[PDB]
Amino acid sequence: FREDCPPDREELGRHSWAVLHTLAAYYPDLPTPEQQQDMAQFIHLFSKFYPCEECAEDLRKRLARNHPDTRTRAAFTQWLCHLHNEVNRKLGKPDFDCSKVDERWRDGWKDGSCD
Template sequence: MSNEKPCRACTDFRTWAKRQKEAYDSEKEAQKKQNQTLISNNGTRDNCPLDKDELGSKSWAFLHTMAAYYPDKPSEEQKADMNNFFHIFSKFYPCNICAKDLQEQLKYSPPETDSQEKLSQWLCKLHNEVNTKLGKPEFDCKLVNQRWRDGWLDGSCD
């Protein structure tokens, strides 16, 4: 059978209906296989809505990566946009407790947007403050570009 969509005007009804059923069954089987591959080792699906910890981890990864690729010499518009981004991000972050905490942190420590280095260091310090509140270990901010932009010096990211 070809991959072309069956043409009803070019095929008798019985053949057309059979091909439609085969295409439907094939699609259904493919969806079933895809769903099975989404089940992780612990029996839960991998494509479920994020919980607070997953959301936090993925959000930090995004923010650090964004900071890692921020310009070394941003324009005034880029500086303002990045500052606005963090304030808007804090208003719409899905975890209300986290959002309010970030809003408070931004009041006494606004984003440092003068360069990639300053933004990355500011974000690392902010992240470490959250880690401290959560009883998690702090990250060595001297390693921030290795972690989020360049890769580790030992070549393990190559």
């Protein structure tokens, strides 16, 4: 019941996926070379400091198997959605439909259910 407590692994995960998907949703459609480098490196550095060891190793192996595609906002928001679905699958959670990621993390649902 006490809200201002350290978050657990699941709470830290929800915070972290919200931060990552939100950063992705606003990344440029046409990023410069340096922004593309900087986002890849951000993701790398995120995985280095993520404080759940099991999460982070798993994750660093995932990233080795599937490198951040930061060429454009489309590629990068989708890449990150595919990444997050691998973690969902690993954990027995259903796939998120990646075609909804702009709705979910930038624009809101088209039916107006977020307004």
